[PDB]
């Protein structure tokens, strides 16, 4: 039933959360790293809005000309780090997945479902990504103040998009490792 499939998914998230509490110290440093990598990543995507809202006469003409000039310089540069984000997500996901393979082996031995396999890790990836991304939208303003103290909050639409790649990561970057593990069988 769809209701059980949710309970299946629900218990899947329950176990995923256990695993989150799992390695609570290891996962503590790990989520620290997850949010940290996100923050290192999100800062570039954030500086785009910084420039966008940033806007004598000797340099006034140059400022007028700079329109659309660096626009590509960030439009491309953001896409680049997205790849590295996917990379770290896959690396961590595979590292976790490789652990308890023998358990997974026996699980397969009894039987299984890709979802019975997938959800335990897919939910985990989505959660790690979402948490790191939220931490990004948070720390953005803190940096903004620590700087303008010498500052802007996340716009609502912007904060709304802040979760998508996090969701995208937990939907796909894991699905990347999914083949690398399943086709291994």
């Amino acid at each position: 039933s769809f209701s059980a499939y949710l309970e299946s998914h629900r218990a899947s998230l329950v176990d995923s959360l256990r695993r989150l509490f799992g390695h609570p110290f290891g996962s503590f440093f790990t989520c620290l790293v997850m949010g940290i990598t996100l923050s290192l990543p999100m800062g570039l995507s954030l500086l785009l809005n910084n420039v966008e809202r940033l806007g004598d006469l000797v340099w006034v003409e140059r400022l007028s000309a700079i329109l659309k000039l660096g626009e590509r310089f960030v439009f491309g540069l953001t896409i680049l780090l997205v790849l590295t984000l996917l990379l770290v997500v896959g690396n961590t996901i595979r590292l976790h997945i490789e652990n308890r393979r023998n358990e997974i082996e026996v699980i397969k031995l009894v039987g299984g479902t890709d979802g019975y396999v997938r959800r335990p890790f897919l939910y985990m990836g989505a959660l790690y990504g979402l948490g790191a991304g939220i931490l990004s939208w948070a720390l953005l303003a803190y940096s903004l103040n620590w700087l303008n103290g010498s500052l802007q909050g996340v716009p609502l639409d912007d904060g709304l998009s802040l979760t998508v790649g996090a969701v995208l990561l937990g939907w796909v970057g894991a699905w990347l490792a999914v083949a690398r593990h399943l086709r291994e069988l």
């Binding site: 358990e103 026996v106 299984g112 019975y116």
Partner: protein, 222 residues
């Protein structure tokens, strides 16, 4: 009741398995096998385990036929029947109950609904000593009995297992054998094989054998 149809075996990439495979099994039956260590009897089971496509010949997979099976249906059949291994397939870092319910966790029944049958099995294997334990607390033979119960779980239609007493010396070996005997006493269609018939000889049974990929190097010996 359920038959086999002269299926030949070959992973010629490694080598050809066996000339042919045909045998008709009534329900609740018991069997055994032995022979030279060159027996891919292990492979024979893996084939019975449907670990690969038939690679030759035909088998009457009970109601179904093993070949041309939907890999989607593979889990469904994998649920249909249980088996064990000569290795201690028990999962450490879990309660004894946890390892037991692992199949139940797969099933998805209500947890209290699971616990009743869980205790039933514990008693069934005379394993009501402790539902939840670290594997290392238990005895080696106790450990094997644990996996025995693991298989016993789900009340599968039939059981396969493997060479039991992988280390059990004759007293324990015989004990485990009798355990399986009682398992069959609950009317059970299940058979295992080993490279030693001496104990198996002490038990009346069909005990068919084959040699070097012979379809049958031995007879029914009913």
């Amino acid at each position: 009741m359920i038959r086999f149809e002269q299926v030949g075996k070959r992973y010629p990439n490694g080598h050809v398995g066996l000339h042919e495979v045909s045998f008709r099994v009534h329900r609740g039956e018991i069997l055994f096998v032995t022979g030279h260590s060159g027996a891919g009897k292990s492979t024979l089971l893996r084939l019975i385990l449907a670990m690969e496509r038939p690679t030759s010949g035909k088998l009457l997979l009970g109601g179904q036929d093993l070949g041309r099976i939907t890999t989607a249906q593979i889990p469904f059949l994998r649920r249909q029947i249980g088996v064990v291994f000569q290795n201690h397939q028990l999962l450490t870092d879990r309660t004894v109950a946890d390892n037991i319910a692992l199949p139940l966790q797969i099933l998805g029944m209500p947890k209290p609904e699971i616990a009743k049958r869980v205790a039933s099995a514990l008693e069934r294997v005379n394993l009501k000593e402790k539902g939840e334990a670290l594997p290392s607390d238990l005895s080696t033979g106790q450990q094997q009995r644990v996996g025995i119960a693991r298989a016993i779980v789900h009340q599968p239609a039939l059981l396969l297992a493997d060479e039991p007493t992988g280390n059990l010396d004759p007293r324990l070996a015989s004990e485990i054998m009798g355990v399986f005997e009682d398992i069959n006493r609950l009317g059970t269609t299940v058979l295992i094989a080993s490279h030693d018939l001496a104990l198996i000889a002490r038990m009346r049974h069909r005990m068919l054998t084959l040699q070097r990929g012979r379809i049958i190097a031995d007879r029914e010996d009913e």
